[PDB]
Amino acid sequence: SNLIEVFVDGQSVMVEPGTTVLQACEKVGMQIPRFCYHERLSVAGNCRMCLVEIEKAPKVVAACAMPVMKGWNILTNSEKSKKAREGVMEFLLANHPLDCPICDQGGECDLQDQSMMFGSDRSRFLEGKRAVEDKNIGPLVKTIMTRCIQCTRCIRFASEIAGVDDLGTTGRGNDMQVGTYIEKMFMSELSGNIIDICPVGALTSKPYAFTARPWETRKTESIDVMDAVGSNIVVSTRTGEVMRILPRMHEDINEEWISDKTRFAYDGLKRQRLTQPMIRNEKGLLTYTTWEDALSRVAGMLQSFQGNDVAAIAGGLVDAEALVALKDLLNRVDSDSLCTEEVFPTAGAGTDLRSNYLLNTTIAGVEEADVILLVGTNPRFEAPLFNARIRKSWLHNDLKVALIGSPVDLTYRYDHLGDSPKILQDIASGNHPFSQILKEAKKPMVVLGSSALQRSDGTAILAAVSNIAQNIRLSSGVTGDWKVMNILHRIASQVAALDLGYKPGVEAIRKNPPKVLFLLGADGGCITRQDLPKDCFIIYQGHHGDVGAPMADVILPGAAYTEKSATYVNTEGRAQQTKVAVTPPGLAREDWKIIRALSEIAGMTLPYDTLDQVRSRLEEVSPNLVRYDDVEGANYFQQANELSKLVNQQLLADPLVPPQLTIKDFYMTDSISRASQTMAKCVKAVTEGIQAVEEPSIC
Amino acid sequence: PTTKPPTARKYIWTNHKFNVSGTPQQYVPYSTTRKKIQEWVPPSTPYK
Amino acid sequence: SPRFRGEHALRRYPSGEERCIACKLCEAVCPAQAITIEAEPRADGSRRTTRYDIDMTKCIYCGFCQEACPVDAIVEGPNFEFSTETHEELLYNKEKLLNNGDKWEAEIAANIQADYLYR
Amino acid sequence: SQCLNKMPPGEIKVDDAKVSPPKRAEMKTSMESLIHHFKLYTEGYQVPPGATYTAIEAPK
Amino acid sequence: DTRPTIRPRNDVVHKQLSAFGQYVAEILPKYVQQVQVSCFNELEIFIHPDGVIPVLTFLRDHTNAQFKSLADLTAVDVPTRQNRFEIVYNLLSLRFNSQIRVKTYTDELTPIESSVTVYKAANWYEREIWDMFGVFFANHPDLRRILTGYGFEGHPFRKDFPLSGYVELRYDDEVKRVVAEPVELAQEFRKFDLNSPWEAFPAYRQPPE
Amino acid sequence: KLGLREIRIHLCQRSPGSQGVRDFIEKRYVELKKANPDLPILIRECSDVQPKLWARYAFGQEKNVSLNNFSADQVTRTLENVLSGKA
Amino acid sequence: GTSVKPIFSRDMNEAKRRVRELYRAWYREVPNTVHLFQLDISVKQGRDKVREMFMKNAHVTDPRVVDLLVIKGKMELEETINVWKQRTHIMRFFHETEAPRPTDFLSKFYVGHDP
Amino acid sequence: GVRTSPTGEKVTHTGQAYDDGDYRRVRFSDRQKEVNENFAIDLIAEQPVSEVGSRVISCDGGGGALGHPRVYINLDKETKTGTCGYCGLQFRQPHH
Amino acid sequence: TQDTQLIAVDEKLDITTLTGVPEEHIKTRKVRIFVPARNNMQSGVNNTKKWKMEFDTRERWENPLMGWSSTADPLSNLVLTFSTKEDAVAFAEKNGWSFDVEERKVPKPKSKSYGANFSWNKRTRVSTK
Numbered sequence A: 001s002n003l004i005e006v007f008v009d010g011q012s013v014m015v016e017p018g019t020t021v022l023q024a025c026e027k028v029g030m031q032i033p034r035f036c037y038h039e040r041l042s043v044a045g046n047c048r049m050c051l052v053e054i055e056k057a058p059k060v061v062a063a064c065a066m067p068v069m070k071g072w073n074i075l076t077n078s079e080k081s082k083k084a085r086e087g088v089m090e091f092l093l094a095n096h097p098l099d100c101p102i103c104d105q106g107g108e109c110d111l112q113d114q115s116m117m118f119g120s121d122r123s124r125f126l127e128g129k130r131a132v133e134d135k136n137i138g139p140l141v142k143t144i145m146t147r148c149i150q151c152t153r154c155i156r157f158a159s160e161i162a163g164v165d166d167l168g169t170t171g172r173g174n175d176m177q178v179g180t181y182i183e184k185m186f187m188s189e190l191s192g193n194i195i196d197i198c199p200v201g202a203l204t205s206k207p208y209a210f211t212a213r214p215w216e217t218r219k220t221e222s223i224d225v226m227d228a229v230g231s232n233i234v235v236s237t238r239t240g241e242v243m244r245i246l247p248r249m250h251e252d253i254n255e256e257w258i259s260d261k262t263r264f265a266y267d268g269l270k271r272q273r274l275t276q277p278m279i280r281n282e283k284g285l286l287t288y289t290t291w292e293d294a295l296s297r298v299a300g301m302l303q304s305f306q307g308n309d310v311a312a313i314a315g316g317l318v319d320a321e322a323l324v325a326l327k328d329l330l331n332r333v334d335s336d337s338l339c340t341e342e343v344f345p346t347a348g349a350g351t352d353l354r355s356n357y358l359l360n361t362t363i364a365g366v367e368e369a370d371v372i373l374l375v376g377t378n379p380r381f382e383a384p385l386f387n388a389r390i391r392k393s394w395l396h397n398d399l400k401v402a403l404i405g406s407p408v409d410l411t412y413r414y415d416h417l418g419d420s421p422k423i424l425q426d427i428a429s430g431n432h433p434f435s436q437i438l439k440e441a442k443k444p445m446v447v448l449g450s451s452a453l454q455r456s457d458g459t460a461i462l463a464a465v466s467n468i469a470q471n472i473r474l475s476s477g478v479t480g481d482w483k484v485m486n487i488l489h490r491i492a493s494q495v496a497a498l499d500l501g502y503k504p505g506v507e508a509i510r511k512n513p514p515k516v517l518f519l520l521g522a523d524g525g526c527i528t529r530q531d532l533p534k535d536c537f538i539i540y541q542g543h544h545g546d547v548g549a550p551m552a553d554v555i556l557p558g559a560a561y562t563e564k565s566a567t568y569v570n571t572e573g574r575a576q577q578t579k580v581a582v583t584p585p586g587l588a589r590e591d592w593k594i595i596r597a598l599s600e601i602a603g604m605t606l607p608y609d610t611l612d613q614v615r616s617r618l619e620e621v622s623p624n625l626v627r628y629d630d631v632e633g634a635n636y637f638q639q640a641n642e643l644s645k646l647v648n649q650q651l652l653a654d655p656l657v658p659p660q661l662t663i664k665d666f667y668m669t670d671s672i673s674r675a676s677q678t679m680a681k682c683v684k685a686v687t688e689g690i691q692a693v694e695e696p697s698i699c
Numbered sequence B: 001p002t003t004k005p006p007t008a009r010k011y012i013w014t015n016h017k018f019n020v021s022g023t024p025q026q027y028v029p030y031s032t033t034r035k036k037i038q039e040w041v042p043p044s045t046p047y048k
Numbered sequence C: 001s002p003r004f005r006g007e008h009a010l011r012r013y014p015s016g017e018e019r020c021i022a023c024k025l026c027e028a029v030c031p032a033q034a035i036t037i038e039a040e041p042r043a044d045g046s047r048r049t050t051r052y053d054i055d056m057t058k059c060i061y062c063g064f065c066q067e068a069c070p071v072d073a074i075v076e077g078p079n080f081e082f083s084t085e086t087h088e089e090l091l092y093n094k095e096k097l098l099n100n101g102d103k104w105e106a107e108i109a110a111n112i113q114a115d116y117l118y119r
Numbered sequence D: 001s002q003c004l005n006k007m008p009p010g011e012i013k014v015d016d017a018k019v020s021p022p023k024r025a026e027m028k029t030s031m032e033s034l035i036h037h038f039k040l041y042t043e044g045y046q047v048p049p050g051a052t053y054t055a056i057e058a059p060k
Numbered sequence E: 001d002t003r004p005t006i007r008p009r010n011d012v013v014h015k016q017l018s019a020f021g022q023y024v025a026e027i028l029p030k031y032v033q034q035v036q037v038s039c040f041n042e043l044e045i046f047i048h049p050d051g052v053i054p055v056l057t058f059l060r061d062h063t064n065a066q067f068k069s070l071a072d073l074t075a076v077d078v079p080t081r082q083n084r085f086e087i088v089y090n091l092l093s094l095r096f097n098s099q100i101r102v103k104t105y106t107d108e109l110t111p112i113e114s115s116v117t118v119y120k121a122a123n124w125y126e127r128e129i130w131d132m133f134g135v136f137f138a139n140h141p142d143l144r145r146i147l148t149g150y151g152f153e154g155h156p157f158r159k160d161f162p163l164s165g166y167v168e169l170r171y172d173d174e175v176k177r178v179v180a181e182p183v184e185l186a187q188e189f190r191k192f193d194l195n196s197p198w199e200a201f202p203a204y205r206q207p208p209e
Numbered sequence F: 001k002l003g004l005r006e007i008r009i010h011l012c013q014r015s016p017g018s019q020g021v022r023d024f025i026e027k028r029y030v031e032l033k034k035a036n037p038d039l040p041i042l043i044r045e046c047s048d049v050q051p052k053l054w055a056r057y058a059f060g061q062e063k064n065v066s067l068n069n070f071s072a073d074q075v076t077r078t079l080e081n082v083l084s085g086k087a
Numbered sequence G: 001g002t003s004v005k006p007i008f009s010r011d012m013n014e015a016k017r018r019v020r021e022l023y024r025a026w027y028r029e030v031p032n033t034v035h036l037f038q039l040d041i042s043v044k045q046g047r048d049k050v051r052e053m054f055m056k057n058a059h060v061t062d063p064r065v066v067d068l069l070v071i072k073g074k075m076e077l078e079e080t081i082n083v084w085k086q087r088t089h090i091m092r093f094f095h096e097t098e099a100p101r102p103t104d105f106l107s108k109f110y111v112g113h114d115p
Numbered sequence H: 001g002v003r004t005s006p007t008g009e010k011v012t013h014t015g016q017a018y019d020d021g022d023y024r025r026v027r028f029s030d031r032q033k034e035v036n037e038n039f040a041i042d043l044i045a046e047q048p049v050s051e052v053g054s055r056v057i058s059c060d061g062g063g064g065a066l067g068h069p070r071v072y073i074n075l076d077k078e079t080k081t082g083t084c085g086y087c088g089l090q091f092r093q094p095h096h
Numbered sequence I: 001t002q003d004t005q006l007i008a009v010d011e012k013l014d015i016t017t018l019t020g021v022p023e024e025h026i027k028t029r030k031v032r033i034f035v036p037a038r039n040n041m042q043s044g045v046n047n048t049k050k051w052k053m054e055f056d057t058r059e060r061w062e063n064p065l066m067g068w069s070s071t072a073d074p075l076s077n078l079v080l081t082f083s084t085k086e087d088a089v090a091f092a093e094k095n096g097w098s099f100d101v102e103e104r105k106v107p108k109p110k111s112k113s114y115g116a117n118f119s120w121n122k123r124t125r126v127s128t129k
């Protein structure tokens, strides 16, 4: 009804009015060369490489910012456009420093490739080049600013995507330099993404510095397990060793960004690893032993002790196959004490209804809502990609945010309604003024963080927010489907566990102390030996022994997310799978294989013997754990609300304080992050000051 | 070398060793890089 | 001739610092994949190979590495009488290549001096 | 004998840094020569799609 | 010259080759599927696999073709195609000093009539295509492995075949024999992913699908 | 003791074959949970899934029961015998 | 579409006929290999291996496939007849130097991370 | 400088020395651990830092084509000395 | 078409016995049909236009002598290319390899506008150039 016809090299293409010349060219397939244009960031038009020729027009237009009009024929390969590209690249390459052998961008440098394709093969520059003093912005991004082409893409990314306005320019002319002027580290959860944004080696990954070349690393696609967003990543490994994590575009989960805890945490999978099985000797000292001895010990203890004295506290980074394997193994000994480190209110519907513990309207739905109400959450650190999506919707759609928890730095400005739990009840009763806004918004959204559920009054908070959702649902201003209630999880191996039937808590252990405990990747340290009865057999199956394995008696080494092909479910309900990039170190094996072999040794052999068989069993327990990259929308909010309005649990007076309220708390959260060294340098950088990040970045 | 002597530098050797194959001064290949994966080094307190 | 291709060797600057900067052009251009390079930022800060192994039993002595090197770090020395009684002695390490560079430096510097203008 | 008596002056490789590496003197001085040398010795020159059968009178 | 680096282009040869391509297309419309002349003046005739014996014979016997020398006979394996194997015949005419290319297609389990009767030089060539790729040529005087070792299992030149194979050789003193074992390399072949993510040649730009 | 360890109802969202199951979970579920507020009745739904009922008993025993094209009363009846068939 | 060219046989029965005569040739041959090639395995110890090789690919049902392995087995017989294979080439059929591999899941889990 | 590990093995410039409880040391007995005594880490340290009197300076490594690609170092920070990324030579402004 | 008593061979094509692949490397492997993701380091999409088929990574240990990446998986560096997903799955079924095809992700068409950088009422107004 509005499509306008534009020509690209003669071909006729229907383009929506407002389409730029670059997108019209992309429709045909031609990719206009560019440096300063990023489809996620704003259009700048300063690189001047998108200069393309329009027929019957004696002026090369900027395809990155020029909207097409009817009858235009974009001559991409015209002689004038080719000469313009050659001149612009000559200007770019004039003052560039001869750092290609020493620059990590070498082999994946946009400048190098565009020079190879759209550019000359020599130089007519017979003068002295410029040189720019390097600038320090922390222990993550090494800056060699003499390589900067001043595309200002990092500045735009910091301003819009990251929110913090600490990057910019200084001066004019050839001496105008991109930096922070005063010394101030670019500290944000999404800071490392600037390394991807920079088309040149001006901004580079410090942990990856001078370690590998782009053409030699094997790329394996996988799913992040640090946070609960489930960002898709590419593990680049060479010589059977993880080298770096890059983002992979998904446009729903993480756009094309990742957090810092996702990027600079691969080193965590190189220290404090469990490689060979450990058993307690006659002094109670952990000693290396063959798999046979440890498995025999565990099998004997499982055979002897049965009933409710058998238990398993699933960890936070565990997969879905291992969870179902452990569930079946403990079910065959009639043990239904499968607990999880995280606590989710089981009162009322509980895990019975999926929508009770799911971010129902998906991450991509945030870009549609008009009012967002976050309750007792700090999405900046709990789920950095979710906060990035909220900011993205805040910029364009002018979405209005409202916080019920403690005041924090959420990049974008929010309206702090307060920090007391009682406010929720007010919004339920309509006494609070914001209720009017909630009833006036056509696409309202209510998000409750899983950290808020960690409190003693989690059931009361869930009941209050469900009352909010029902109150705004009875008024039909909310559109047809528009699932309002949302629960934002933090632990990756939570939703899947809640899908399988694991108890959303650890209270089963305290209520019924078991004489054997299967710590499966459990490192939160919620339950210790003091809570357990004496002479308790503790089994730890994990990769990094930090808070768990020291407590256990058998330290059966498990496999990590980069070392297994396994299913993880994000907070929206989508179930993705990570693929193997490196094999487990030493004698460590896959988690599900360990559980199945233990079941075989103990006698109660599990049916599944292959990964496909375990996936089939996962389908048997839950059919939505195999529909990979498919959000299975839940329903029946009314039933969950009706079951919720029976407990009448009373809110407390303690303010809703998120566990993480500063950058310092974001880094060292899980076992891999704790064992890593770069996150230690990061917490050091943020804690004391700027003096801890000085280094010779000249090379 | 008597007329034109080669340029002198510190790192250049001062005793031209011949083919050291056979003699116990052979060359044995070995990895010149450190470890990649570290171990957990379990604690010493019996505790349990 | 001064262009003769023989035993591979790693040269170094007159100051004493190695010329190699681990740009991995030689490893990326070797037709036989005979070079293995692992790099790591040194204590000073300069990027140098933590491992630079060249497998003489797999090398084809093409000289492509010495052309690819942008700092004239790796060269094919004039030595050709380096036969070994055991196979393992032909698997060159970084230390062995550096020893070759320090041993044949007098010859290799003159050979490059008499040929760099042709390149 | 004819080739020895008719050797012409000129260069040795096609004057195109995208199919022939630049001179070592130019590589260590200029941006484009360094970039082209890097890409040629790491990636190589992209040959246009197609197929050909070229034969010569080898001494066999 | 104005193009000291660009290879000179001959257009008279292009016209002659195009004329002969139309000639061959008109002569045998039964098998000739598509004829094309490359930019560097090489003519390729794509025929139906049933036209292997007839078309070649024509090109060998016609007064206006007189292609009496099978220079090369080879195959190219493209897994993404239905009939992956693509057999190529290169012929040279000494009377009209011209080279021609006749290219046919064939899947894994479809036979091709052996051109040994027409070109007796093909007899060895065919075996190679059988050994390297697995294309079986019916009506062949003797089809056998020509390059691979005796008892080899597989067709090495197939794309779905590792360059290191599956089996290596060793000498075992226990059996005093040159035994074969599963392959196990001391250093795995480092697969380099060298491919610029920027389009090289605008001319060969596949239209979007 | 097969004390009815867990119920798993796997119904499809949109196909008419699970329609009756939907009606059941629409209406005859709140009172069901009120009856026994300990049963982990699982309603894990998925697209393109034949409506089925799994009854995990003690010691890891399961008996799948198909609910294809069942009515709301039909699903109710086919579940009541399951949770009433245990002591 | 569903109907395609044949290699040699025009039905499964003729392919089975060709398999039968190929087995005929191999079974008649085996003792001649044992004597001529100076093998040390017993005659039956080669005939049963011929049987096992025939039984390996006993699941195929596409005729053209059956003709293809008929030709391949004919070629291997051809190599075995006119001493084109040698003692080592023939002995490769009996995988002798290869250590026995385990079949149960438990041993595979004990030995390494493989399917 | 090359130093001796507690086992007796000399450490290379890469900090490589086989552990005491490592069987690989068997290869070195009746042989020697080939190491290079001339450590590049030390040898570049005592090279004097040139007092360049300009804001920026060009380094080619000496010898023109014999050296490394010519790069320009910006000598503006008074707290550090500009070091060439190819050869390691340092430069410093004359007390600014 | 083909007049040689053209026979119906409806049953699906299978060359598992005509490739020479050993027993182990034909079902315990799992190929992966996927369109490679764009290298986020760069900004070119010319490497995301052809489907690729690859095999699961296996054990990669260190050589005791020098430390190489020794492996015993022949189908580790072998990756096929395909013009379309259907052809790739046809190749996978033809060779009898278990697969798990991932759909081709496509960048969603955005809506760029230079004017929004200098808006008067909206929050897209940039604070810098």
Ligand code: SF4
Binding pocket: A096, A097, A098, A099, A100, A101, A103, A104, A105, A106, A107, A109, A110, A111, A112, A147, A199, A200, A201, A202, D035
């Ligand atoms: S950014 Fe690095 S690789 Fe790219 S042109 Fe500059 S020095 Fe070379």
Ligand code: SF4
Binding pocket: A147, A148, A149, A150, A151, A152, A153, A154, A155, A178, A197, A198, A199, A200, A202, A203
């Ligand atoms: S530092 Fe990088 S991203 Fe920032 S302006 Fe310079 S080239 Fe662009």
Ligand code: SF4
Binding pocket: C008, C026, C029, C030, C031, C032, C034, C035, C054, C058, C059, C060, C061, C062, C063, C064, C065, C066, C076
């Ligand atoms: S000269 Fe030797 S080391 Fe250099 S590329 Fe050729 S084979 Fe490799």
Ligand code: SF4
Binding pocket: C019, C020, C021, C022, C023, C024, C025, C026, C027, C037, C065, C068, C069, C070, C071, C072, C073, C074
């Ligand atoms: S090409 Fe030269 S500088 Fe680059 S890695 Fe090889 S030896 Fe070192």
Ligand code: FES
Binding pocket: A033, A034, A035, A036, A037, A044, A045, A046, A047, A048, A049, A050, A051, A062, A063, A064, A065
């Ligand atoms: S991309 Fe249009 S000018 Fe930078």
Ligand SMILES: [K+]
Binding pocket: A105, A194, A195, A196, A197, A198, A199, A200, A201, A202, A203, A204
């Ligand atoms: K970059």
Ligand SMILES: [Zn+2]
Binding pocket: H059, H060, H061, H068, H084, H085, H086, H087, H088, H089
């Ligand atoms: Zn220098």
